[PDB]
């Protein structure tokens, strides 16, 4: 693409500069370029990829929710007709969001997942696949909605099965996957009981394994554990 002429190492370096500058669209474009070099990503490189796109799509999602709320209020009894503009603009943001998700899913499919043999990498990328299908599901309202939901579920489930076999209960990737799959259950799949049970069992299993950890690992694991607890507090 436009990054084809730039060295892989330079793309990585610039991704890191973009991160420091909070230039997440640039960060994402640099990491897309790096992925497209065809080489596997290191642990640190995976994190750059994920953070870049998380921030880009997160901004889009937040804008979409503002616009969708305004649209929904426009459809209430007693609201003045204001024309097609709110729908149009919501649709514009939606289409851009969908495009970013499709871009990420395309990187995963060509060829990050298929080349990922270690559980760290494979679980990481399958979690991402679940996340971006989840974001597609958040805006879906038509005949593929069920299929999009199932795609998210499938990816998360595969990642869960690997993570349970291959990673300790306190591994940050395993914990973040469980966190996000629980969010899927609660917010997408109409399965709040499943969400709660997953979050509880994940938390408890991790607590039981903290004793095996160094101080640094302990800090990393207890961080995400707190996110699980935050959702449990909100949902119960």
């Amino acid at each position: 693409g436009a990054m084809g002429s730039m060295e892989r190492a330079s793309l990585i370096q610039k991704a890191k500069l973009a991160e420091q500058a909070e230039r997440y669209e640039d960060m994402a474009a640099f990491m897309k370029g790096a992925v497209e070099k065809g080489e596997e990503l290191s642990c640190e490189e995976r994190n750059l990829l994920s953070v870049a796109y998380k921030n880009v799509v997160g901004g889009q999602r937040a804008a979409w929710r503002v616009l969708s709320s305004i649209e929904q209020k426009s459809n209430e009894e007693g609201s003045e007709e204001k024309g097609p503009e709110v729908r149009e603009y919501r649709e514009k943001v939606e289409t851009e969001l969908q495009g970013v998700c499709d871009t990420v899913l395309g990187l995963l499919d060509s060829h990050l997942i298929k080349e990922a043999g270690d559980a760290e990498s494979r679980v990481f990328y399958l979690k991402m696949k679940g996340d971006y299908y989840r974001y597609l599901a958040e805006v879906a309202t038509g005949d593929d909605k069920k299929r999009i939901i199932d795609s998210a579920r499938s990816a998360y489930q595969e990642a869960m099965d690997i993570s349970k076999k291959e990673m300790p209960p306190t591994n940050p990737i395993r914990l973040g996957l469980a966190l996000n799959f629980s969010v899927f259950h609660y917010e997408i799949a109409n399965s709040p009981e499943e969400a709660i049970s997953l979050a509880k069992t994940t938390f408890d299993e991790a607590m039981a394994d903290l004793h095996t950890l160094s101080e640094d690992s302990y800090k990393d694991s207890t961080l995400i554990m707190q996110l699980l607890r935050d959702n449990l507090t909100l949902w119960t």
Partner: peptide, 6 residues
Amino acid sequence: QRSTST
């Protein structure tokens, strides 16, 4: 408060 993800 929204659900939290990572």
